Amino acid sequence: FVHVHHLINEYRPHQARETLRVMMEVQKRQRLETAERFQKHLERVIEMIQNC
């Protein structure tokens, strides 16, 4: 029981830090993808505007 508690206490902080880093990376990737999509949409809008 003592060894199990020690292993749980040792594995909790590293797992939490890894999850936080993965969440930050996912948020950064989603923000970059949204920015690229908005840029492409604005380009298509300018193209459609200059079309007429």
Partner: protein, 32 residues
């Protein structure tokens, strides 16, 4: 950082039209 509470908020999400409708109903209720 440390935003897992909102990052794992999978029912526990674009601009909801119902929220805008409720806000308009609260705003267009009277021209105070």
């Amino acid at each position: 950082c440390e935003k897992q509470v909102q990052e794992v908020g999978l029912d526990g999400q674009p601009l909801s039209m119902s929220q805008n409708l409720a806000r308009l109903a609260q705003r267009i209720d009277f021209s105070q």
